[model samples]
Target: MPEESSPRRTPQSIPYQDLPHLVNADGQYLFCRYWAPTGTPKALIFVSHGAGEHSGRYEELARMLMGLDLLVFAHDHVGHGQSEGERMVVSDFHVFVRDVLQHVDSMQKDYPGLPVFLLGHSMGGAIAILTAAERPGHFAGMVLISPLVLANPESATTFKVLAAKVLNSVLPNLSSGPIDSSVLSRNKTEVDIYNSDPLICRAGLKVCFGIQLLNAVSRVERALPKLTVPFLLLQGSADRLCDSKGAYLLMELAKSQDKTLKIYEGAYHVLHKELPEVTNSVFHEINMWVSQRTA
Candidate 1:
């Protein structure tokens, strides 16, 4: 369910004539798109999309960075975008992670001996953190955007677990329900675009997808202390979809001496898509950081 048009498109992202290819666990093809600097690639940036979205969503952002001389590789994780298997949902967390990692390894082959930066947003952000922890030094650095961290401060109650177990067992890919307005950011414009955008998924939430996301969040909390790469954490104070407190917790536990935490006040969960004033500042800060890295 990719959107035909996004609210914003950066001139930096040159429209891709042909998309990249991705093969999943079950040997199904997934679609991805990439952008390179006008000339030689200075570095490779691989990004994983959030739940209910695909890599194509980052076209605008990718275009902007490519203009900065950075090669960008953004892919739709399995069950998202043009990826085969499930639709807008996943039944297992580990399997999804493996699929994403497989793509990263494949992309790295193209930039031998150059810096590789891995980025993940929302659910994908959580996955990126765990992946970096498991294989320290695997990437030059990481950027996590409004990561979909655990919700409950404590372990999930028995009732919730039982619900997911029973529901997924009975219906592996059943849509749970309509998008709950309560879980979305307070930003009205974001909600408006999300609701109307054709590419934005309006499908009922899948039971198994929720379970996998929660499970991944818990795993990230436990793995924080083990992550060693230089990391950048971005969160929004007004985002209802994720917990800024979780970002704070990560800052406290992460052992990386080069960790950078940025909290945008009044910003929504989708920082890049926030209001003009907010996104402008957000991009400025991010581009400044990225430029320093490249320099």
Candidate 2:
């Protein structure tokens, strides 16, 4: 029989055959990115991106890490980027974690003996914490930027919380408020790019999906006590998307003896893409931190 030569394609219509990718347990072809160094790598870093965003946004950070000879890898989460799924919707938060574990486990086999670390931003940070907690000693450490450890005080009020739950059961797809892109960064250039990025999911979050996020946060709080992995937490003094209180809670709950927290006086959620000063500082801090571990 003659084969039709059919192939999987990105949401953008790019064929997976032309790109590096992985078929997850659900049989979804996830778009993947790798920043391998020119020399033998000292470590592997897997990045998990935040909600409504893609892994491509980590290009600058991945490139810098690669320059340090860290083999950096990431994929667009199931729905947010080029992966196959409804935009910004997930059946369960664990699916994200499961996909990451599948990818990380596969990567680890190829580069056994090399120390590995996790890097996450916003919601990705929650994924990292849960992943580290799940594996215990499997990872060397973690780097988190404005992670979503707690629900925003403004949005998570007691009444609204119950309301969301009610709305979720009745109408799971009821749209909530959209993320404020302006508050994402202090850098106009980065904000412009984020707003213009074709890969970003700009649709308002659904009530049921928000419930999944809340569930993840609840899991993260439970996981922190068991998490002894070393970590470097980066947060902003004024971030509206995620509460800074969550970062403080992580400091107190996590038993890691080598945990470090760096708070920018008035940075925003996207510290890596903040103003030049903040962005450079974030990159340097991560590079310097990873260097210490890989050595």
Candidate 3:
């Protein structure tokens, strides 16, 4: 170990050497988190968190999976949270997918032959879709909550899409404005916690990044038809961030035999942290689904 050179640091100026992390293909440090059960694990779960948030935000859900005697792991994607790179900036949407595969591959290497699953929310859902598509028979199942299968109608009109594409060529860094934290959930306390979290990237989505998301939607559409892995899709009917319609569309296009979609009435985008009842239901839905599949 070369101790003479100054170690690379995270955005918070913490040395990557001191923390559990992985260096990505592009040489970016990604902070990693793992929740191991007290006893032997039945399966492995890789969590792909939503955009503008880090893997740590999924702690509650991960702990629930851990209680099921499943080993759960994730890494902050390059460019978000304590990871290296610009805030929420990605040159291509596939980079997110690439890093996920990279991190998951490393984990699979450590725990050989365990059935693997993906649990993703929002943009992370898109990443999960593409990753599974890339390796058709590798994943046992998936749990998707409010995935970005289509562009929201209001913001993704043909004209606006064209405008964004043109802007990506010109002003890629132009601000699209901050995410409306209010519409994230109905639970006041969770909203406050989300808003106050320093690890959550607050930068308004940039035009470059926004275009990458549109690209992801297109890719997700293509990937859905080819998907054969079993999956559970959870959606909030009242969700404004990602239209619930996408969930229906996925149900229609997905080729999986054991697919299920559970829609929560009048719920918000962040179902995992939504009102207590909704949150509990979401957790139960996931717990039952994963435990059964693993068994």
Per-residue alpha-carbon lDDT of model 3 for 1-295, expressed as tens digits?
6668788899999999999998888888899999998888999999998889999999999999999999999988878988899999887999999998998889889989899999999999999999999999999999999999976797677426655566657765466678888987999999999999999988877777777888888899999999999999999998887889899999999999889999999999999999999999999999999988986
**TM-score, predicted candidate 1 vs. hidden true structure:** 0.84
TM-score of each: 0.84, 0.95, 0.96
lDDT of 2 by residue, 186-287 (tens): 899999999999999888777767778888988999999999999999999888877889999999999998899999989988999999999999999999
Every candidate's lDDT: 0.72, 0.89, 0.89
lDDT of 1 by residue, 110-147 (tens): 66777888778878788888778778877788888888
Question: Where's the lowest-lDDT run of ten residues in candidate 2?
Answer: 158-167
**Listing every candidate in turn, what is its Cα RMSD in Å to the true structure after a full C-alpha superposition?**
6.8, 1.7, 1.9
**Residue clash pairs of candidate 2:** none
Clash count per candidate: 5, 0, 0
Clashes in candidate 2: how many?
0
Positional deviation of residue 42's Cα in model 3 after best superposition, in angstroms: 0.5
Q: Cα deviation in Å at residue 41, candidate 3?
A: 1.0
